[PDB]
Design a protein around this ligand. Structure first.
Ligand SMILES: NC(=O)c1ccc[n+]([C@@H]2O[C@H](COP(=O)([O-])OP(=O)(O)OC[C@H]3O[C@@H](n4cnc5c(N)ncnc54)[C@H](O)[C@@H]3O)[C@@H](O)[C@H]2O)c1
Ligand SMILES: [Zn+2]
Lengths: 8, 272
């Protein structure tokens, strides 16, 4: 889990 | 009564704080809101018509680098006059005072604003990069850059109001690499949505999270990954985590404490 994202 | 809901007891948090040997403080944009730097949660997440998460992406930079550079240039120029607030100062002063006692404080920040540095924090992990660094898309070199304006074509550009026209600067006139005559297109040295955080930084983050005995999670929405999973990892080892935010988040119920309100009020109280 190194990748930047937004949740929801 | 079994289900733990977070406590709002400042006295119980301060009992842990008095004894803690290694404190991790994770921050997002809310720790800079009281310096006049808006977060991206509401109206401050818009620049012209775009939401900020739609500009901080390598797909926007590949297909419209002038637009993405106008947005970063706006931010750089606005940030130059901004000052540390009481929250950033509490964080910095806490590190200095505890360091004299052989106790460790480290700041893991989502922010690229450098205001924790300006405030006096020494142990700082800037996990998303810096507003004041560039990276060359050709040779990979990373450099500090505080120049106002970063390149001549960006002088007077970046205005944020909807209806402002794009500068449409030819790519050759955007910031270029000066290292060993390279000439490549520079980008901000900022981790964008869809990109991987630096592995070396993540390994340091994992070491701090594994070893800490108290964690504060300050001014973050806890919806930006992977950063959102840092404080829950600490809480799930049974270590107390205290959230400082003006509102509850999707992570709040995982934590031992929730102190609701502006962190420039609650941090000085908690870290005294
Ligand atoms: N200062 C900066 O470098 C800056 C500014 C905006 C956004 N960003 C970054 O862009 C990403 C998206 O930003 P975002 O704002 O959507 O998410 P975020 O994770 O950074 O959320 C900001 C949080 O701050 C809280 N908050 C607002 N005012 C506060 C105050 N005075 N005290 C305590 N908490 C307060 C909000 O309730 C929200 O939970 C994040 O990674 C963030 O760090 C950086
Ligand atoms: Zn280069």
């Amino acid at each position: 889990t190194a990748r930047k994202s937004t949740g929801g | 009564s079994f289900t733990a809901r977070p406590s709002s007891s400042m006295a119980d948090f301060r009992k842990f704080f008095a004894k803690a040997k290694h404190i991790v403080i994770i921050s997002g944009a809310g720790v800079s809101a009281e310096s006049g730097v808006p977060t991206f949660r509401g109206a401050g997440g818009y620049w012209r018509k775009w939401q900020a998460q739609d500009l901080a992406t390598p797909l926007a930079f590949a297909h419209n680098p002038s637009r993405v550079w106008e947005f970063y240039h706006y931010r750089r120029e606005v940030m130059g006059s901004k000052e540390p607030n009481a929250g950033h100062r509490a964080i910095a002063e806490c590190e200095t005072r505890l360091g004299k006692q052989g106790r460790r404080v480290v700041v893991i920040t989502q922010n690229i604003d450098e205001l924790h540095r300006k405030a006096g924090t020494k142990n700082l992990l800037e996990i998303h990069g810096s507003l004041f660094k560039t990276r060359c898309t050709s040779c990979g070199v990373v450099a500090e850059n505080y120049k106002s304006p970063i390149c001549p074509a960006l002088s007077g550009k970046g205005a944020p109001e909807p209806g402002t026209q794009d500068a449409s600067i030819p790519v050759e006139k955007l910031p270029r690499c000066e290292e060993a005559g390279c000439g490549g297109l520079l980008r901000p040295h900022v981790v964008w949505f869809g990109e991987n955080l630096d592995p070396a930084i993540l390994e340091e983050v994992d070491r701090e999270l594994a070893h800490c005995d108290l964690c504060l999670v300050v001014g973050t929405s806890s919806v930006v990954y992977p950063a959102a999973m840092f404080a829950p990892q600490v809480a799930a080892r049974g270590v107390p985590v205290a959230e400082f935010n003006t509102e509850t988040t999707p992570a709040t119920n995982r934590f031992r404490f929730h102190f609701q309100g502006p962190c420039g009020t609650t941090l000085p109280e908690a870290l005294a």
